[PDB]
C-alpha cells in the first residue's frame, strides 16, 4: 500500500481547504484515497478522491469546498461540490487515508491563524 506517498502540505485554520503533496518518485493514483476531516464540535466527514484523478510526482493538490466562495480551477485546485464547511471548527484532525484504507498521515490543525501574510485580500 501507499504508506505516506501523499501526505498533508498545508490545512486552513477553520479547514476551509486541505492542501495535500506527493512526495512519490511516481504518478499516485487517486480515488480510493479519502481525506477523514473530524472535528470534535461534531461535525467529521471523508471526502472520498475521484478515481478518474491521478496526482502527480512531485505535485500538490488543493482540495477548498464549495461553500469557501472559490473558483474550481483543476486540476490544480479541485473543490468539494456540495459541502460548505469543509469539517469547519476551532480543533481537529485533518486524517489522509491510502487506497488500502489505512491512516498514512494527519495533522491536528486549530483556529490559531496559520496562514501568516493575508494581508491582501
Known amino acids: ?3 505516506g506517498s501523499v501526505s498533508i502540505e498545508e490545512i486552513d485554520l477553520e479547514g476551509k481547504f486541505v492542501q495535500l503533496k506527493n512526495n512519490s518518485d511516481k504518478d499516485q493514483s487517486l480515488g480510493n484515497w479519502r481525506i477523514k476531516r473530524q472535528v470534535l464540535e461534531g461535525e467529521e466527514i471523508a471526502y472520498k478522491f475521484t478515481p478518474k484523478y491521478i496526482l502527480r510526482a512531485g505535485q ?14 483543476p486540476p490544480s485546485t479541485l473543490v468539494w461540490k456540495g459541502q460548505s464547511s469543509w469539517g469547519t471548527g476551532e480543533s481537529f484532525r485533518t486524517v489522509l487515508v491510502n487506497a488500502d484504507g489505512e491512516e498514512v498521515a494527519m495533522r491536528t490543525v486549530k483556529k490559531s491563524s496559520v496562514m ?4 491582501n485580500g
Open 1 to 3: 500500500s501507499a504508506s
Open 60 to 73: 500538490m493538490v488543493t482540495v477548498w469546498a464549495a461553500g469557501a466562495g472559490v473558483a474550481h480551477s
Open 116 to 119: 501568516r501574510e493575508n494581508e
